[PDB]
RNA sequence: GGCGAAGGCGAAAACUUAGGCCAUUACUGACGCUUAGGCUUGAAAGUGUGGGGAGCAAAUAGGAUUAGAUACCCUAGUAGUCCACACCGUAAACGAUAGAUACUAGCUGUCGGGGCGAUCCCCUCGGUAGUGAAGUUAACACAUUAAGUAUCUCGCCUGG
């Protein structure tokens, strides 16, 4: 995140912010096939879809 | 979601619509997908291109602040 | 959209035409000249190449069918202008 | 009385009619329409006179120059089709010609064959009476 | 009359937005409430013809079983029919390997008879856990197959309140060629049985008069009460 | 053709001098002119480029030769008086129409109902209304009709009926 | 989700061009299918040329388990890479499925338009995942988003 001073609220959002930053940096910090490079995002989206319609 | 789909114009352009942009854009300066924005598919690409222009236009940062 | 209303309305094969053999082939050749100029200006445009081949061969089979189909309704554009 | 999406010009009327009939037999369809064709009118009429066909009607749009023809593939009120299968002997690419000496029975003689001989369509059985041969178009029963 | 329109007020209706057009001659288009509604005059004529057929065949006094539990109200209605006019029934339905082969059910009825005769002696004299086990075997009898006690043959007619709810009762009966009466609601052909009935019971106000009119169309054969055949008697009640 | 241009002037500077230099930059258009003298006032860049914490926003709307705006895209972007030259035209995903304008009654209705501002009505902004009539005005229809009715025989009760009285 | 000759297409912007989609009660009078032959592009790797080389990088150098670790582990590290000319011509280029014609239940939805209609719900036509009856089948399973049915042509396989 950019701000964090709350005791219990902002940390949970910061967790997903860090997860998003990791997902965004795990495609350009190391060169690889674009196949899996996009498959990771597509599979994350698919997993997030069917769990909660 | 966008007012443009609710009025009918079939396109948008950067006329400093930043207000509605803040509904589509997280405070993290990253474009949320079609789910959050609420466009159907056409205004979705319109707001996508507008947000990308704003990135180019420096209306919205890429990530740097 | 290079030409859509020029040659199909200024030229009337029969009593009235909105789409026919020779108006279509004349517009097709106008777009052929336009596309050849475009690809001479920009050599790496292949979609135009395939479209031009399709257009010219469709024109050729248009003329081939119109040979027998009508006595003489094709002797206005059977040639090419690219030399 | 067209079904939907009016039928355009196929490669040959008989093939389009065969598709329509097979689809009627498969997907529970009763009345089917085909492009205007005099041979279609003749074959529908002779199938009606044969007893395997229901009502057939020529159809026109806002204009009368274009035409189509619809017909009810004869279904009894207990969901059974009168026509159970078709086969074409003559094909657009190969119009097989069989003279009067080349008219046998239909797989036991139970079926019906059709020939385009001189004018209109004649059954091979009645064509053999007039010592008439010709190009046989289809076998049906 | 029979199948009168006083019985058809919200009788029609089914699941929202899920239907196959295999139902061709009885279901009307639905997009207002998505609950598939149906035409009524055709149902009246078909059900009157079916009543004539069932009374004619019931004058021979054939065996009939009550098997349908689409909703709780269907269960209540079939219980009412069993307590008023019955010759044999099954609690829920055949569980498979029981309809196209009644050996597994003839032995079931014989074992029920012998189990009652044997448990008449069990008076908590050997093991109390074991007499609870026997009472629980009886309980499982009522749950799985408590209805098969008086049916000594294969019924000539089998009621099917839903082709999607009576898998065994339809399939095993269709292995043989016994006459079968079934409904057709939203996703099946109306031609899977001998006589056609496109009626439904999923609606709360439907199965009441449906079951009453079916029951009083056969109950007259056994010289038993008949109160829904042409009488103005009717019910407007929710499913329960 | 039609051309709306969004201007990004370099860094923080006076409004009028930037307007004049943006006019000079519009002069680089050979014949794309007919501008309406206006601007978007002051709007700062949300992020520092490397030392540019703010800028000024100007809009220029006019028409001309479409080929002759590429040279503007060169000159404005190169010269240190414009940073971004945003162009509007049909190549960017277009939807405009000069006859779809009679839909601004829906604009007023949605401004009213983008969020229901009354305590009595607090419906979600994404819920139906259903005054529905279902207008089509596009069907591709053909008026097929029967003129010769031969062989009277039809198939309407195609549902099975069988298995009469059984003992 | 759409646009896509395939290969694909996303920091933007625009010149241009192409393909559309919906609707036109319309015209040449069906003027079109496949493709011998000819034409065209072709993911990507890499190549000579001139330049650039930021960055990583094979091969590996060295080092860690090791019976061997040569494959998998870490660092140093160049060919390579990269920009254009010329050459690249293949991919698990696939839809494991060449097409074109005509026809054939549906449905949850949704997309582009014609849209009445805050948006809507609701559709008309084309599209986008599934669905299941006919149909299909060695079975997988497909099914009007056929592996369904018929018409015309190019490519192929006759056991390994």
CA distance B47 to B12: 7
Which structure tokens are listed for E182? 């079934």
CB proximity list for B15: less than 8 A, separation 6 or greater: none
Sign of CA pseudo-dihedral D31, D36, D41, D42: negative
CA distance E15 to F115: 33
Q: CA D19, D24, D27: angle at the middle one, nearest 5? A: 110
| D/B touch flag: 3 or more CB pairs below 8 Å | no
CA distance F58 to F86: 11
CB proximity list for A47: less than 8 A, separation 6 or greater: none
Q: CB-based burial of residue E136 (10 Å sphere; 0-12 exposed, 13-18 middle, 19+ buried)?
A: exposed
Sign of CA pseudo-dihedral E230, E231, E236, E239: negative
Query: Is residue E60 helix, strand or coil?
Result: coil
**Helix F15-26, helix F70-78: angle, nearest 10:** 140
CA-based nearest residue to E42, from E235, E201, E198: E198
CA distance E56 to E99: 25
Buried b (16+ CB within 10 A) or exposed e, F51-76: ebeebbbbbbeeebeeeebeebeebb
CB proximity list for F84: less than 8 A, separation 6 or greater: B56, B57, B58, F6, F7, F8, F77
Which structure tokens are listed for D141? 């029963």
Which helix or strand (DSSP H or E) is residue F114 part of? none
CA-based nearest residue to D21, from D49, D50, D43, D5: D43
CB proximity list for E49: less than 8 A, separation 6 or greater: E195
Please name the residue of chain E whose CA is at the shortest distance from the CA of residue F165.
E57
Q: Which residues pair with residue F3 across a beta bridge?
A: F62
Buried b (16+ CB within 10 A) or exposed e, D84-115: eeeebbbeeeeeeebebeebeebeeeeebbbb
Question: Which nucleotides in chain G have some atom under 7 angstroms from a protein Cβ?
Answer: 1-2, 5-6, 10-19, 22-33, 35, 38-42, 56, 85, 100-126, 132-135, 144, 146, 148-153
Please name the residue of chain E whose CA is at the shortest distance from the CA of residue F132.
E32
Contact B50, B13 (CB under 8 A): yes
> What pairing do the DSSP bridges indicate for beta strands E195-196 and F2-8?
unpaired
CA distance F160 to F162: 7
Q: CB-based burial of residue A17 (10 Å sphere; 0-12 exposed, 13-18 middle, 19+ buried)?
A: middle
CA-based nearest residue to E151, from E96, E87, E232: E87
Query: If you search the block for the tokens 């503007």, which residue do you land on?
Result: F72
CA distance D6 to D13: 14
CA distance E12 to E203: 7
CA-based nearest residue to D56, from F150, F154, F145: F150
Q: What was the structure determination method? A: cryo-EM
CB proximity list for F166: less than 8 A, separation 6 or greater: E57, E156, E179
> What pairing do the DSSP bridges indicate for beta strands E157-160 and E64-65?
parallel
Buried b (16+ CB within 10 A) or exposed e, E95-115: eeebbbebebbeebbeebeee
Which structure tokens are listed for D139? 């076998």
CB proximity list for E80: less than 8 A, separation 6 or greater: E211
Query: Is residue D80 helix, strand or coil?
Result: strand
Give the DSSP per-residue string, E162-201: -TTT-HHHHHHHHHTT--EEE---SSS-TTSSSEE-----
- CA C2 – C1' G6 distance (Å)? 27
CA-based nearest residue to D35, from D71, D10, D56: D10
Which structure tokens are listed for E152? 């000594």
Count each helix (H run) and each strand (E run) in chain E, helices first.
6, 4
What is the SS3 assignment for chain A? CCCCCCCCCHHHHHHHHHHHHHHHHCCCCCCCCHHHHHHHHHHHHHHHHHHCC
How far, in Å, are E28, E38, E198 from residue E12 at the CA level?
A: 10, 6, 10
Q: CA F142, F148, F150: angle at the middle one, nearest 5? A: 125
DSSP H helical segments within chain E, as ranges?
41-58, 72-84, 103-119, 128-145, 167-175, 207-215
Note the Cα D115 to chain centre separation in Å: 11
Which structure tokens are listed for D124? 């091979």
Q: CB-based burial of residue F10 (10 Å sphere; 0-12 exposed, 13-18 middle, 19+ buried)?
A: middle
Instruction: Verify whether the Cβ–Cβ distance F153 to D55 is below 8 Å.
Output: yes
Contact D78, F164 (CB under 8 A): no
Contact E32, E125 (CB under 8 A): no
Please name the residue of chain F whose CA is at the shortest distance from the CA of residue B63.
F47
Residues E217, E218, E221, E226, Cα dihedral to 10°? -50
How far, in Å, are C2, D89, D92, D111, F112 from residue D96 at the CA level?
A: 50, 7, 10, 19, 75
Query: If you search the block for the tokens 């749009």, which residue do you land on?
Result: D61
Contact F120, F132 (CB under 8 A): no
CA distance D26 to E51: 33
DSSP H helical segments within D7-141, as ranges?
13-26, 38-50, 124-129
CA distance D48 to D58: 14
Note the Cα F24 to chain centre separation in Å: 30
CB proximity list for F22: less than 8 A, separation 6 or greater: F7, F9, F58, F60, F81, F82
Query: How many other C-beta atoms lie within 10 A of the C-beta of residue F158?
Result: 17
How far, in Å, are A9, B28, E12, E78 from residue A3 at the CA level?
A: 12, 11, 59, 67
CA distance E222 to E215: 12
Please list every residue in chain F whose beta carbon sits closer than 8 Å to the beta carbon of residue D45. Answer: 150
Go through chain C and list every residue after which a break occurs, taking a C to next N gap over 2.5 angstroms, comma-separated. Answer: none
Contact C28, C59 (CB under 8 A): yes
Please list every residue in chain F whose beta carbon sits closer than 8 Å to the beta carbon of residue E181. Answer: none
Q: At CB < 8 A and 24+ separation, what contacts does E107-116 make?
A: E108/E145, E108/E148, E109/E148, E109/E149, E109/E150, E109/E151, E109/E152, E112/E141, E112/E148, E112/E149, E113/E149, E115/E141
CA-based nearest residue to F163, from E171, E2, E57, E175: E57
At E143, phi and psi to the nearest 5? Answer: -70, -60
CA distance E159 to E178: 12
- CA B34 – C1' G103 distance (Å)? 39
Q: Tell me which residue range forms the domain holding B22.
A: 1-65
CA distance B58 to B64: 10
CA-based nearest residue to D98, from D138, D69, D63: D138
Q: What is the end-to-end Cα distance of chain E in Å, rounded?
A: 27
Q: Write down which chains contact chain A via at least 3 CB pairs under 8 A.
A: B
**Helix E128-145, helix E103-119: angle, nearest 10:** 150
How far, in Å, are E58, E195, E197, F114, F164 from residue E51 at the CA level?
A: 10, 11, 11, 58, 13
CATH of domain F4-88: 3.30.70.60
How far, in Å, are A50, E80, E85, E148, E168 from residue E93 at the CA level?
A: 36, 17, 18, 10, 8
Q: CB-based burial of residue B55 (10 Å sphere; 0-12 exposed, 13-18 middle, 19+ buried)?
A: middle
Count each helix (H run) and each strand (E run) in chain B, helices first.
4, 0
Which structure tokens are listed for D14? 């008989």
Which helix or strand (DSSP H or E) is residue F57 part of? strand F57-63
Assign residue F138 a region: left if phi > 0, alpha if psi is -120 to 50, beta otherwise?
beta
CA-based nearest residue to D76, from E185, C36, F160, B23: F160
Q: CB-based burial of residue A18 (10 Å sphere; 0-12 exposed, 13-18 middle, 19+ buried)?
A: exposed
CA distance E171 to E176: 9
CA distance D61 to E212: 52
Contact pairs from chain A to chain B, CB under 8 Å: 7
Which helix or strand (DSSP H or E) is residue C78 part of? none
Query: Is residue D88 helix, strand or coil?
Result: strand
Provide the residue count of chain C.
Answer: 83
For chain C, the 3-state helix, strand and coil shares in percent, each to the nearest 5, are 60, 0, 40
- CA A39 – C1' G84 distance (Å)? 34
Q: Which residues pair with residue D116 across a beta bridge?
A: D135
| B/F touch flag: 3 or more CB pairs below 8 Å | yes
CA distance C1 to E22: 48
Q: What is the end-to-end Cα distance of chain A in Å, rounded?
A: 28
Q: CB-based burial of residue D54 (10 Å sphere; 0-12 exposed, 13-18 middle, 19+ buried)?
A: buried
At E187, phi and psi to the nearest 5? Answer: -140, 30
CA-based nearest residue to F69, from F83, F52, F89: F89
How far, in Å, are A36, E99, E157, F128 from residue E144 at the CA level?
A: 53, 14, 21, 47
Contact D56, F152 (CB under 8 A): no
Residues 27-86 of chain E whose Cβ lies under 8 A from any Cβ of chain F: 53, 56-57, 60, 62
Query: Is residue E95 helix, strand or coil?
Result: coil
CA distance D125 to A27: 77
Contact F65, F31 (CB under 8 A): yes
Query: If you search the block for the tokens 């009374």, which residue do you land on?
Result: E55
Domains contained in chain B, number: 1
Residues of B with CB under 8 A from a CB of A: 27-28, 30, 65
CA distance E82 to E88: 8
For an interface test with A, give the residue of B26, B28, B31 to mutate (most A CBs within 10 A): B28
CA-based nearest residue to F60, from F97, F24, F99: F24
């Amino acid at each position: 995140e950019v701000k964090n001073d709350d005791l219990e609220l902002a940390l949970k959002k910061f967790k997903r912010v860090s997860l998003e930053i990791r997902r965004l940096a795990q495609r350009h910090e190391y060169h690889l096939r674009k196949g899996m490079r996009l498959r990771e995002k597509r599979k994350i989206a698919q997993k997030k879809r069917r769990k909660f319609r | 979601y966008c007012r443009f789909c609710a009025i009918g114009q079939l396109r948008i352009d950067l006329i400093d619509d930043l207000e509605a942009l803040k509904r589509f854009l997280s405070p993290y300066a990253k474009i949320n997908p079609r789910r959050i924005t609420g466009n159907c598919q056409m205004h979705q690409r319109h707001v996508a291109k507008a947000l990308k222009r704003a990135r180019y236009l420096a209306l919205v940062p890429f990530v740097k602040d | 959209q290079i030409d859509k209303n020029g040659i199909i309305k200024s030229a009337q094969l029969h009593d009235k035409d909105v789409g026919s053999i020779q108006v279509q082939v004349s517009l097709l050749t106008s777009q052929i000249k336009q596309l050849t100029d475009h690809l001479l200006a920009n050599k790496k445009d292949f979609i135009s190449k395939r479209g031009l081949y399709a257009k010219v061969s469709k024109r050729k089979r248009l003329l081939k069918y119109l040979k027998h189909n009508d006595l003489e309704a094709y002797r206005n554009l059977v040639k090419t202008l690219n030399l | 009385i067209t079904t939907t999406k009016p039928i355009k010009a196929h490669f040959d009327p008989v093939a389009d009619l065969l598709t329509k009939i097979n689809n009627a037999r498969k997907a529970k369809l009763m009345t089917v329409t085909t492009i205007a064709s005099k041979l279609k009118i003749a074959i529908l009429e002779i199938l009606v006179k044969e007893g395997y066909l229901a009502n057939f009607q020529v159809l026109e749009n806002k204009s009368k120059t274009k035409r189509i023809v619809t017909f009810n593939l004869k279904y009894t009120q207990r969901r059974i089709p009168s026509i159970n299968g078709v086969k074409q002997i003559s094909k657009p690419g190969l119009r097989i010609y069989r003279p009067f000496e080349k008219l046998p029975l239909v797989l036991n003689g139970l079926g019906i064959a059709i020939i385009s001989t001189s004018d209109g369509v004649m059954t091979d059985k009645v064509a053999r009476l007039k010592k008439i041969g010709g190009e046989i178009l289809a076998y049906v029963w | 009359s029979l199948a009168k329109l006083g019985e058809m007020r919200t009788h029609v209706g089914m699941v929202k937005r899920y239907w196959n057009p295999k139902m061709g001659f009885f279901i009307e288009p639905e997009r207002k409430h998505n609950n598939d509604h149906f035409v009524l005059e055709l149902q009246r004529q078909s059900l009157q013809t079916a009543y004539n057929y069932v009374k004619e065949v019931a004058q021979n006094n054939g065996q009939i079983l009550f098997v349908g539990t689409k909703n709780d109200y269907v269960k209540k209605l079939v219980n009412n029919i069993a307590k008023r006019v019955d010759v044999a029934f099954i609690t829920q339905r055949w569980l498979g390997g029981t309809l196209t082969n009644f050996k597994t059910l003839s032995i079931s009825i014989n074992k029920l008879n012998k189990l009652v005769e044997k448990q008449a002696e069990n008076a908590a004299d050997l093991t109390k856990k074991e007499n609870l086990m026997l009472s629980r075997e009886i309980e499982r009898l009522e749950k799985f197959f408590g209805g098969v006690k008086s049916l000594k043959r294969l019924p000539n007619l089998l009621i099917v309140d839903d082709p999607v709810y009576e898998k065994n009762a339809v399939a095993e009966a269709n292995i043989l060629r016994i006459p079968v009466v079934a409904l057709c609601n939203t996703n099946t052909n109306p031609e899977l049985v001998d006589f056609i009935i496109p009626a439904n019971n999923h609606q709360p106000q439907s199965t009441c008069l449906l079951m009453n009119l079916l029951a009083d169309a056969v109950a007259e054969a056994k010289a038993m009460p008949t109160m829904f055949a042409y009488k103005p008697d009717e019910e407007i009640q929710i499913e329960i | 053709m039609q051309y709306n241009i969004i201007l990004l002037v370099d860094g923080s500077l006076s409004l009028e001098q930037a307007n004049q230099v943006n006019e000079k930059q519009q002069q680089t258009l050979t014949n794309v002119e007919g501008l309406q003298t206006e601007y978007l006032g002051l709007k700062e860049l949300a992020y520092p480029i490397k030392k540019q914490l703010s800028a000024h926003y100007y809009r220029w709307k006019f028409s001309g030769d479409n080929q002759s705006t590429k040279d503007f895209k060169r000159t404005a972007n190169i010269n240190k008086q414009v940073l971004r030259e945003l162009i509007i035209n049909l190549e960017r995903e277009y939807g405009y129409l000069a006859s779809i304008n009679p839909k601004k009654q829906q604009l007023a209705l949605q401004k009213r109902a983008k969020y229901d501002e009354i305590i009595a009505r607090e419906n979600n902004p994404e819920n139906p209304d259903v005054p529905v009539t279902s207008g089509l005005a596009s069907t591709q229809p053909r008026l097929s009709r029967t003129e010769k009715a031969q062989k009277p025989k039809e198939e309407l009760w195609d549902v099975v009926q069988k298995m009469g009285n059984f003992d």
